[PDB]
Assembly symmetry: D2
Homo-oligomer: 74 residues x 4
Amino acid sequence: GPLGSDASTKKLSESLKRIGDELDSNMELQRMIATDSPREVFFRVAADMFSDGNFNWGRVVALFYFASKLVLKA
Amino acid sequence: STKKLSESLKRIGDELDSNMELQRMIAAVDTDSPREVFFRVAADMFSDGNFNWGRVVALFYFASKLVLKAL
Amino acid sequence: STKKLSESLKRIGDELDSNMELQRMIAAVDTDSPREVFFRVAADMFSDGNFNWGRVVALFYFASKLVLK
Amino acid sequence: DASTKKLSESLKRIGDELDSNMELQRMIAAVDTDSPREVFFRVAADMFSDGNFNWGRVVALFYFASKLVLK
Ligand SMILES: [Zn+2]
Ligand SMILES: [Zn+2]
Ligand SMILES: [Zn+2]
Ligand SMILES: [Zn+2]
């Protein structure tokens, strides 16, 4: 409503809109859902995502974006 | 194989989490009205009507940060 | 040790999926239009002002089954 | 709009049952939060050792991972 809130909300929504579309247009992902135990796929992908020791929340969210399509779609 | 998939998820996750511009936008948001912020951001996010799963996941990432800011 | 925490999370997750009434209520929404259902369901979930992580996770469980199905 | 009221009430109860479960909150609070990768993988490995990879279980792990990493 207020002008300060409307602008900060707009900028934040666009930034999250951009990251959201990057996940949905991830072509390496779209090809992976297409030897296929979902648990093993999840653990092999999850192991590779965190092999460098960095376990941050954005990576976990991306991992569960992957898990949702892996479980529900395929 | 699994490598390129996990690298792209690594790359997008590190954009959601370590983009300094995005983090300081999230940090500035009203910390004592999480319900009100969540719906304002969600309304602009889906004002174009495209209700894609990638955008819903990013919204839930922002909600998790809102609940953390209030905690 | 962590076997009890994993067993409890196991129980929670299986109780969600095996809740037929929940599955039926989720399968009874205008699937032609996901955005309006999400905002309607979410608006009624937080009218209390009770914006907790638990409720957000329950909305996430519903939103996924709504969009990806 | 009563079918949406009934569903919303169900999800409200599920979320509040999670957060008010003192035994669950105690078990979550006891893990080594300084070792999130090790904790997350040990819990996930035990949660899926039986071969059931259903979506409800993945969300329960997601509820755990969020409290493990954010707080
Ligand atoms: Zn305005
Ligand atoms: Zn980008
Ligand atoms: Zn304020
Ligand atoms: Zn330690």
